[PDB]
Design a protein around this ligand. Structure first.
Ligand SMILES: CC[C@H]1CN(c2cncc3ccccc23)C(=O)[C@@]12CN(S(=O)(=O)CC1(C#N)CC1)Cc1ccc(Cl)cc12
Ligand SMILES: CC[C@H]1CN(c2cncc3ccccc23)C(=O)[C@@]12CN(S(=O)(=O)CC1(C#N)CC1)Cc1ccc(Cl)cc12
Ligand SMILES: [Cl-]
Lengths: 306, 305
């Protein structure tokens, strides 16, 4: 029993974190095999960030201008290249701790673990979600760029995020491991702001199913709804539209609890209208949206507390 | 910016988890040097759990009755002993991944990371606190016994909890690594319940400081209070009494924000008496009490391991 915001064990990723230095800038890098991946903005000054010409800044750099430190060992850079917004530094040593891995680009609503790092040293691990506005609500200080997000379904690490920037509202932006930003963001200090964010409806429904599995049903009601009427109501509370894909994805949680997806949608419509009236759901007074259907199945018992 | 429930990196602990089997029971063990630590209830059957005589059950066991598996390797047990509610299995191989470590017993209000494990394989990591009633609000299913809680200081892992049991209210109970239970619990299938819990006041104050550091200031006010008047309010809302030690501990946060501890106590008093009025603090509609003053300082400073 119980339900917590649970991150994947970070050991496989800790063994890949290194420090990358270029001039007076130091940030984190991810060392997989003989390549170190890091944000290309490591080659910029503060002044460069207004209108950086990355190709022009990079052509003036040699391999020996990049210092890579893994623990207390200095790695030798033997090649460099830029791929989108990521710098790839070829090193003379393959990481002996390289786990089995993949690079995966995720969609809004998907969750992942973040291993926050400073100076190539891991400091903490936490769970987060890619928001519908393509930002993440992380916890990152200056020096955390290059920290990565990942999932570890089975013994394979799927890297999905590399940290690049903090927006004026205190939320965060970054790229996949091929250097493509999530969202319309750029690694340039422009007028960039997070777009209006919305609640991840499919995740709130998954978390309501988690509460039922854990033994709570106070929020259920005798009503159902059509998908269209549910969406008309949801959008009035800044909730994302629920699609037929989301209904299909909720199928196994619907079967384990005996509550049809549209029946759970009617419960969510009522909670949006009434609030909780002094009650909590899984120890929260707000409707939680950073647990996916997959996360609930991963954590919860396969047996409902009826 | 940002404030999350953050756990310590779990790698040093992952390298210590093993599976321990005795008969038809399988649970997790902690392998440090040549000893594997696990709950002594691994030697019990379902019927034995009803009223176990652990010394009598243990004397009938040989070393070869314990199967220890580390990854895909079978470790050979060469000795066994009991220390309080923990079984110590001496093995023929020292763990090559043993980190620098200590066994520490924590006090209520202190937080730690839990590495949830099943069949000797780590599944997830989360943060929690030792409640004033000595239970933890964990997330554990059957097979999680032997999972451990810990903190890290530089390169040293301080192991503080080993999981043993789930109570009827869905909360959890366990021991330190010397096998002493936190709370008035016993390792037997008998009627046991979590006592009435209280809110960890010093931790709520620490989290209010974290909200100020992050830009949430709406709850601040011009008022102050005495420690005695604050405690008269706190007792009425099932909050733990705030001591001069707690005030001293909040000093490094009181100086970094310019808000005196008793000034923040006056904000907490008004929050208790009036509520949040539709507002949230760090994305929460409840007053969060599972961040210690040290956790706030560490997350707002970037301490590494
Ligand atoms: C090039 C250095 C990075 C570092 N950084 C940060 C990353 N994570 C956490 C941080 C927390 C504190 C301060 C910096 C943080 C960034 O946002 C920087 C620096 N900033 S900044 O200082 O204006 C950012 C900010 C605002 N608004 C003050 C928060 C411009 C910029 C523009 C594009 C990109 Cl891709 C990165 C960056
Ligand atoms: C001997 C097996 C352990 C396993 N366990 C569990 C540990 N964590 C999470 C679990 C979640 C699901 C079921 C078991 C859980 C326990 O609480 C057991 C089994 N239980 S029980 O099944 O009656 C407990 C319960 C209640 N109330 C139904 C939850 C008796 C008992 C008594 C003393 C001790 Cl030290 C341990 C235990
Ligand atoms: Cl995805």
């Amino acid at each position: 029993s119980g339900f917590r915001k649970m991150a994947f064990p970070s050991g496989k990723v800790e063994g890949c974190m290194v420090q990358v230095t270029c001039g007076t800038t130091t940030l984190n890098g991810l060392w997989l095999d003989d390549v170190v991946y890091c944000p290309r903005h490591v080659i910029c000054t503060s002044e460069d960030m207004l209108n950086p010409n990355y190709e022009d800044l990079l052509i003036r750099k040699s391999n020996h201008n990049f210092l890579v430190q893994a623990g207390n060992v200095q790695l030798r850079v033997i090649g460099h290249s830029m791929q989108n917004c990521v710098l790839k530094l070829k090193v003379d040593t393959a990481n002996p701790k390289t786990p089995k891995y993949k690079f995966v680009r995720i969609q809004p609503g998907q969750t992942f673990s973040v291993l926050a790092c400073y100076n190539g040293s891991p400091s903490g691990v936490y769970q987060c979600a890619m928001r519908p506005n393509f930002t993440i609500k992380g916890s990152f200080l200056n020096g955390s760029c290059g920290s990565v997000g990942f999932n570890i379904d089975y013994d394979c690490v799927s890297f999905c995020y590399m940290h690049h920037m903090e927006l004026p509202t205190g939320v965060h932006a970054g790229t996949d491991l091929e250097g493509n930003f999530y969202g319309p963001f750029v690694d340039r200090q422009t007028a960039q702001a997070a777009g209006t964010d919305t609640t991840i409806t499919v995740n709130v429904l998954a978390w309501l199913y988690a509460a039922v599995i854990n033994g709570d049903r106070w929020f259920l009601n005798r009503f159902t709804t059509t998908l269209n009427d549910f969406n008309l109501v949801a959008m009035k509370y800044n909730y994302e539209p629920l699609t037929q894909d989301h209904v299909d994805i909720l199928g196994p949680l619907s079967a384990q609890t005996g509550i049809a997806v549209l029946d759970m949608c009617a419960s969510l419509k009522e909670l949006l209208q009434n609030g909780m009236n002094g009650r909590t759901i899984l120890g929260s007074a707000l409707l939680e949206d950073e647990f996916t259907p997959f996360d609930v199945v991963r954590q919860c018992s396969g047996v409902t507390f009826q």
